[PDB]
Amino acid sequence: GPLGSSKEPKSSAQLLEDWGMEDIDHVFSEEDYRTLTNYKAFSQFVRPLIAAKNPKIAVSKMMMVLGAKWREFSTNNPFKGSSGAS
Known part of the structure; x- marks a missing residue:
């Protein structure tokens, strides 16, 4: 059966949740x-936004959240081209 070991990636929420x-x-x-x-x-x-919910988080972890969020952002973002085309 098709499993797909890499279909659903860990989102920033997932990562943060995975850390509790x-x-x-x-x-x-x-x-x-x-x-x-x-x-x-x-x-x-x-950055200050997420830090408002988790101020005692490790920076190494935070950078993963930020990076993943940028990805998530760009994913749900319909505007491929901010000013029209990209």
């Missing part, structure tokens, strides 16, 4: 997609 931590119940919405168009703009927002 809670994530920000925020949802990257349409306006967020159009404004956080790059990782630096993204991290500057999302």
